[PDB]
């Protein structure tokens, strides 16, 4: 109904990253989906500008766009990548790959 | 062309806040407009998940949405508000009201 985290399995070969990512083949990135219209939920954690823009968009829908459900906190994953030498190397904390929290911004 | 900060003057009476905000009558909130498609600019400061989602959306446009140009840093303003007593009170740093930086998230 509103801004929330939903599932999103990403295949690295489909996005053209299999050339430098050996493993894993796929991973769970999640995504943020849902509207930011009023009334909001108790755990949306919206900013005051997101609230203002939503109100302005309600009054002028053709001139001002809506606020967006977006990742507000990200989590790392581990990836096995080949470096310039070409040897499998483990990046233990490859930051910013998975959604931890969603929100209206 | 891409994700950037553009002007947005917000009238407090139009958004139904004039009941508790005496001054100012309007203020400059800015907004974030633009696409997040490739190729990106040098100052978009995108997250890796925003990059992954943009790639996945390119491959599956009907199943995965695009990343969004959103405020990544906010600035405060000062407002003159009437409190429960009804006396004009100055909120010097009313946080989160103006866009400082935009970005793809
Ligand atoms: Cl609400
Ligand atoms: Cl805020
Ligand atoms: Cl690491
Ligand atoms: Cl650790
Ligand atoms: Cl990293
Ligand atoms: Cl690029
Ligand atoms: Cl990141
Ligand atoms: Cl203050
Ligand atoms: Cl100060
Ligand atoms: Cl505040
Ligand atoms: Na995929
Ligand atoms: Na897939
Ligand atoms: Na309009
Ligand atoms: Na650990
Ligand atoms: Na306005
Ligand atoms: Na106006
Ligand atoms: Na598709
Ligand atoms: Na000051």
As a percent range, the share of strand residues of chain A is 35-45%
List the bound ligands: chloride ion, sodium ion
Name the CATH class of chain A.
Answer: Mainly Beta
Q: Structural class, judged by helices and strands of chain A? A: mainly beta
* Head-to-tail CA distance between termini of chain A: 17 Å
Disulfide bonds (chains A, B): 3-69, 32-102, 36-104
Protein name (chains A, B): Growth/differentiation factor 2
Subcellular location (chains A, B): Secreted
Function (chains A, B): Potent circulating inhibitor of angiogenesis. Signals through the type I activin receptor ACVRL1 but not other Alks. Signaling through SMAD1 in endothelial cells requires TGF-beta coreceptor endoglin/ENG.
Note the main attributes of this structure.
homodimer, 105 residues, mainly beta, Cystine Knot Cytokines, subunit B, three-stranded antiparallel β-sheet, two-stranded antiparallel ribbon, 1 helix, 11% helix, 44% strand, elongated, binds chloride ion, binds sodium ion, signaling protein, BMP, bone morphogenetic protein, TGF-beta family
């Amino acid at each position: 109904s509103h801004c929330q985290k939903t599932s999103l399995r990403v295949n690295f070969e489909d996005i053209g990253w299999d050339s430098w990512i050996i493993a894993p083949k796929e991973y769970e990135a999640y995504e943020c989906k849902g509207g930011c219209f009023f009334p909001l939920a108790d755990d949306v954690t919206p900013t005051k500008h997101a609230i203002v823009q939503t109100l302005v968009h309600l009054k002028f829908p053709t001139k001002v766009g809506k606020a967006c459900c977006v990742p507000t906190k990200l989590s790392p994953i581990s990836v096995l990548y080949k470096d310039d030498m070409g040897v499998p190397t483990l990046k233990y904390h490859y930051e910013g790959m998975s959604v931890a929290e969603c929100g209206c911004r």
